[PDB]
Amino acid sequence: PQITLWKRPLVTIKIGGQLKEALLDTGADDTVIEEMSLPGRWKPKMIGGIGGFIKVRQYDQIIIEIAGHKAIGTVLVGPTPVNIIGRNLLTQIGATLNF
Amino acid sequence: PQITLWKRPLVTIKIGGQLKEALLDTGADDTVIEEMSLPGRWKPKMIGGIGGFIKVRQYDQIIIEIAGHKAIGTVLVGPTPVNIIGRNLLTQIGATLNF
């Protein structure tokens, strides 16, 4: 689809058996999800932005369904104020910015 | 143009006669630039990012070119880690997300 930017570009995702709303975010390198359980190994990471840094858990090789499109990649889990789909998964669904 | 997301979507902007680099960021409602001089009065705004909230200076009706496209609108100035072009200006340049 073509999503305009008049409002926040929010979509439904499926991750870990759960449905969530998330922001399609070209400014985010990585995908960052609010606290939830995911299977497998993880390692700690710090990520930063406006307001400073937060600590997250990095899970690799996680499958997500984004607006009906399946992708796999790393997911960061921690105290983000909104679920963010970053470039590492936007590429896999073929998302582009067009103007 | 059609911009893929394998790398950060960095473009050149021109503001105040000066060229700067900025990130096209669909996850930002507003445009936020690092400390610089802009004309006119400003008003206060608080914005929340991944690590918390920061105070910025809001300047309205500022002339700005984004990847060659002319825009006139609101620019927030403050301690952002990167210059960010948010949805207020992405809509003026006709940008959409496509997949």
Ligand SMILES: COc1ccc(S(=O)(=O)N(CC(C)C)C[C@@H](O)[C@H](Cc2ccccc2)NC(=O)c2ccc3c(c2)[C@H](NC(=O)OC(C)(C)C)CC[C@@H]3O)cc1
């Ligand atoms: C390593 O992977 C990363 C690293 C950093 C980030 S980031 O979240 O810090 N960020 C990087 C940028 C700053 C280079 C992505 C960015 O899209 C972020 C992504 C983001 C968006 C929202 C909050 C946190 C992070 N948005 C904002 O920081 C942002 C900017 C301006 C404003 C907001 C957010 C504010 N958004 C807001 O409060 O959103 C709600 C109400 C939905 C929570 C509105 C006011 C202002 O217009 C994400 C993944």
Ligand SMILES: [Cl-]
């Ligand atoms: Cl990845």
Ligand SMILES: [Cl-]
């Ligand atoms: Cl591609």
Ligand code: NA
């Ligand atoms: Na894993």
